[PDB]
Amino acid sequence: GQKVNSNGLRFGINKNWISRWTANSHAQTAKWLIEDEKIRNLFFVNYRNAQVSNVEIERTQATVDVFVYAAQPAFLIGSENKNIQKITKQIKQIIGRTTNLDLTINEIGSPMLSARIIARDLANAIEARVPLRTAMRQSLIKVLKAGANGIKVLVSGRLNGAEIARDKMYIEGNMPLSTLRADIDYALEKAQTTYGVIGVKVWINRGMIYTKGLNRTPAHILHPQKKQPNRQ
Template sequence: MGRKVNPIGFRLGGIKTWESRWFAERNYTQQLHEDIKIRSTVFNRLSNAGISHVVISRSGDDLNVTVYTAKPGVVIGKGGATVDALRTELENMTGKKVTLNIEEVRQPELDAQLVADSIAEQISKRVSYKRAMKQAVQRAMRAGAKGIKIRVSGLVGGPSSMSRSIVEIDGRVPLQTIRADIDYAQVHAYTPGGRIGVKVWIYKGDVLPEAETSGQAATTELVGSR
């Protein structure tokens, strides 16, 4: 089962939560498409800012949009001009008051979206896919990842080659363990030979329940006292 579904969706309600945090008794479809437009606008306007993900929450007619980025300075802009322009555009698009928050991703090497974007960008610039994959794996493991898996699929050898999938893996990536904190992203790289898919799984460790964690701490303290 863990190999057949999105690793993030598989863990929703367990160790992961939703990126759209609101409830609608009516107008659900309208608000859903509004969220899609907001994310599309943010990613298009800030394509060079290393955007990881966008969290949207609603309270009445107010929208709270939190942008997670590896380059907060690029998002904010000189004197806050870029973020103000983006807020105004979102307010004009939705007709609602928008509160825009910027959060920094402190370890981009452990963010699957940013790693996949980096690999896709290098492939688009005709950098060797093997080199891009190996460097991404090494950086993630040095940053503290428990395991990482990267799959690149398509005409990786050029327009005249055969379509195939190349996998680079280090450590362990337990997809079927629900308490395993696995970040996942899928990105497309556009090349003269066609579109190449890049998938990244990053395993950061297990998320244990508080009761189990406190029980382990009590057991450790008891053994230490003996």
């Protein structure tokens, strides 16, 4: 049957919001809401070879702050800070010159156990004509070796160019979806294949959060260092 979004079921209890701002009026609540979606989509659609895991947005009456986590930030940084200037101009055109931006790339730790880049890698493999069975298994084994709990991958679509759509799942371990205390990270991606669209869904279990609180604490960014800059 149908299931409630795993990310959406855990918001406001154990998971913080990706955008944290309070608008002035119901007219300014819509502009500030579509614009941040454009920024997030920009980061995700293009600049994909970087493995951007999550982009957070922080806005005040007039000051915009962006916290961008990536696995390989060299591509964003570019050759002696070139590509970086380009993206700043991109961000300024979307929000406006009248405001103040404080974009912040922040390098990420433990990149494997994140459902976003795994789905992106999965989608790239399917688009690259890689056999589906082999592609998921290599991603599954590497993620488990990274030192996490069970992972559930559902890859539904016109499998292998077939005319009848199927779906292949591969769970390997305890994925307690009905439990609220668990840390389940979820992401979904659309692999654009020449024979249509492939939907990949990745459920990852990253332990149990036994410390009550609406997070305010990082998630799989702590193990190695996490810095770099571009801020003020």
